[PDB]
Amino acid sequence: QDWEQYRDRVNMLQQERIRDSPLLQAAKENDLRLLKILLLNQSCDFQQRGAVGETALHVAALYDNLEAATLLMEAAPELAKEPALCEPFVGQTALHIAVMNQNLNLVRALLARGASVSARATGAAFRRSPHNLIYYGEHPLSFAACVGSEEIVRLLIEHGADIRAQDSLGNTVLHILILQPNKTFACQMYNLLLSYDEHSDHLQSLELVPNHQGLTPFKLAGVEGNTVMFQHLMQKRKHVQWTCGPLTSTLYDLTEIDSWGEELSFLELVVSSKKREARQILEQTPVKELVSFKWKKYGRPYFCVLASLYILYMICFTTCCIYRPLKLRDDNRTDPRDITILQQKLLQEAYVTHQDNIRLVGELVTVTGAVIILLLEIPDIFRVGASRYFGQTILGGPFHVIIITYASLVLLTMVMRLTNMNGEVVPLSFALVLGWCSVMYFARGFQMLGPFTIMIQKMIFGDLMRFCWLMAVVILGFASAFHITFQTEDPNNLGEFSDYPTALFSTFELFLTIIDGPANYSVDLPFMYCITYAAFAIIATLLMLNLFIAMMGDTHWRVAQERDELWRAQVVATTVMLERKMPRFLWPRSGICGYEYGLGDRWFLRVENHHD
Template sequence: MDSNLSLSRPESDGEDSSEFTRERVFKAASQGNKSELIGLLDFLLANHKQLTSSDFIDETNGKTALLKALLNIKDGKNEAVEVLLDIADKTGDLKELINSSYTDPCYKGQTALHIAIERRSFEYVKLLVQKGADVQAKANGSFFQHGSKRGFYFGELPLSLAACTNQLETVCFLMENPHRNADVTDRDSQGNTVLHTLVIIADSKAENTEMAAKIYDEILIRHFKLQKHTGVQLELIENHQGLTPLKLAAKLGKIGNRPEMLRIEPLRSLLRDKWERFASKLFLMSFVMYLIYLAIFTTVAFYRKEGEPPFPVENTPADCLRCVGEIISVLGAVRFLYKAITIFWKNPPQKMALFTDGFSEILFFLQAALLLLSAVLYFCGQKEYVGLLVLSLALAWMNVLYFTRGSRQLGMYNVMMQRMILSDLLHFLCVYSVLLFGFSAAVVTLLDDSSKVKNVTLAGGGRAEAESSKCDKPSYHDIRFTTLELFKFTIGMGDLQFTNHVQYKEVFYILLISYITLTYILMLNMLIALMGNTVQKISDQSETIWNLRRAITILDMERSVPKWLRSTLHSRASEIVCFGTNQDKCRRFVR
């Protein structure tokens, strides 16, 4: 603060100049005009007021003059800040002023320290902490909540805010200042520590990930130096979802180097040992059991009864076996549905998860849901149950591809196929659907209504069977039939038999040539080219993703084993791994 500035106001001729209102103080604070604050101290002392009195706080949001001044820092400076702090010190409400926060639901809990960090003013951060700022104050308004579309989530704490905005100097100061050190183990309203928050704000950008990893490591190192006597392991702290920072990173799939962790020791050898010791046997057993289930399901569907369901169980060996097979099929669907819902509850489907393991879980969920819906329709006496039954059967056979992750070559092939379905083929189908429907509607509109086949009354009042069969034949006036015929043109099986029924053949030929050019020539060849490019681009990634899928499978197999049996599956073998040339930095890893 400028020591040449007197906080006491000299004698003034006008009464208005000696009257300080909230608007006047806020205006001076926002403009950084310390000369307008001359006499404020005398006014407060004379009227027994403070800067935290209700007269100088915005009743709508709890904003104080200090918050107003910090929000209007220009070129890293606002001279009104020092003046306000000095006045509050002399009126006895310094800590109250510094730790006053917003009270409105949107910015609730935001203090002067939060704003100083947000404005990247390291000097004011040091000044506020020196004056008694609460380094554990939590800004828990709706604007700062995770998932807010218009807000910014940073973990509520000042330390988390500094970490998420890449202010390493401020992070180090908050952890090691001589006044009050920030508690790194403190958690926000969602149970997230500063490490959880860094994982959440990290994305696939290399620069962002590098920044988050750098601050993440720095916090770990400094916490170990400062709090090693406490024995608290920062990376083992769980949030309200029961996730450590590493588990959260695995769930969100945001950290780019997470798949590469499977290539380093001792993790790779540990996973290989588990796969060879018990996971491969359990996986093979699951595959055989699924094939048996699939054989039963297929047999039941193939030898289903004809007629109005539900069918009574007859006292014959064949019918009893059919009934047992139906029960096994439904119970298997219940198990698949329960497992899928459990996985979705713990890890809701996300776009990134589809490229790792979520694709298979969704197919198993659809298979089970369709079969159970088919069972409901069956008992309700609806013949439509057959449609859902065959769809579930088709998905059941598709889900055999899930077990390709047990083989390296087949697993990598399955990874490439799923990546192309989720990217190239999905984009192709979106564009192709628009073109197919648009040209089908145009062709149907162009057909001549007088060309519709009509019944011809024969002599004697009878009707010819040939004419009746023509009436039952699908017409090109039906947009569904026309859409199917145009689809045949896309795959080179089109039929031009309906060209005689169009009103304007020239316009029809223009539509047909345009459709074939856009779909059969352009889009199909573009799809083939894109798929080839995708294969080349992800050939290196496919093995990594396959390793990741197999690692997930190993962990799922291990969790499915009863606790009393897990100890017998672990070899308990140990291996000493040294880091660098220093023999003192050796660790023993137990399998």
């Protein structure tokens, strides 16, 4: 069964036992007079529970019923301390339910009895999933903070609610408020929980308490794509120096963005986030002024020096494919089967020559230039995880599938040599169509060439191959029908259709008008040919091509703001990708340090404004 149909059984079987039991019936309906009388004559033993396993007070708190709920707590002393027992609802007590409803007087009544403010709700319907519409955490302080009810929030802290508790995923009360869809109404709540902070607990500040996967609530505001909470967490870390007219020289702290850490870099997590909204943190005023300083000062010359050691490499690999050891044809086997054109095979002559030694040192450059590419890509596979890394389209994208299968086919051609294999022309032709089309990677600078090469990528996955599933059928339709008409005829006159793997290939060419329409006006073609071909020229090359241009012409202004918003996030992905690699010799640390103009040990970045 699906889980969606499993919980629909449980939420409806609960509604049966409320109808069956007379005590639970009056709780929902606020029948006070029954609940006074039915609790006199042996007030019912409260293991009498629903199929979920809840008491009468959980039913009385699930509905807005003050007066019936208080009469149950007077007769029964301990209903505030009982959990539910069904597996998607484990531990949800009456205090978890009264807080959710924002019921002001019922929470006051429950806390007067001493209900535990540290009860976990560990059910399978409270954990975060794409098929649960709420994620409010486990502790009841977290329930009050997410519903925007500030009066219950300050009421629980006065009774012992600890703002430093964590749920099973590790999220504290601050991690959850960033994960809420109501973005602009949690900033009022985040100011409140900092005033209740102990300021005694050394655990360093609550803003720096880590998740299980390592994210602090500052660092989680970036990954989530929360542009409102990012500015709020930055008001603590800027200093205003002077205001001279319209100018204002404010001074940002730059420590939780200038992370000098082994793998938890803030600028890595923002660009490699799967959330679409994370590409807008990169335009906020302490960050946009930073990654346009790394790029224009250092990241642009090191990416133009290194994009011409890769043109001078591929121009050293084609001139060692052209010059390759072809002897003369030492055989007369081309005279049988006059259909064959073939001539001179191969050699083993890198040694005995005057111009295969200049060719030799042009090969060992290409041999030890395809092992360096394997040493800079393979240990970068495991860090991201081999399935995110080949598909992000920003963090490299599908230019790491090409750049490895280029460097793998240079090493095969070495093993095709030194053992005297024959088909050396098969990897050399796959290397040169992939090796040059990887030089197209280095248009990630060059604002001119930049956003164009995304559109090639976006029209080869989205809009070309949905045109090609419905044309592997039309060129199987007509191509297997031209083979039938010319199966009778002679192949010496109009012999484009002589064998069935070329019946498909001549018809795929006729689709593109590359080959002309096959006609011979000195002979009688069969009459069935000119009917099937007058239908092929309307479906294939009026309609199907001129509608593919139109499909290309309207999905290009839909992606108008979206490829240009994606290019500026592809310069930031290049700058952090280089800062892992190049050694500390190159790249002094960004920002003016502060131990000589002595305030501390932090590394600052100065940005001045103009009030328009």
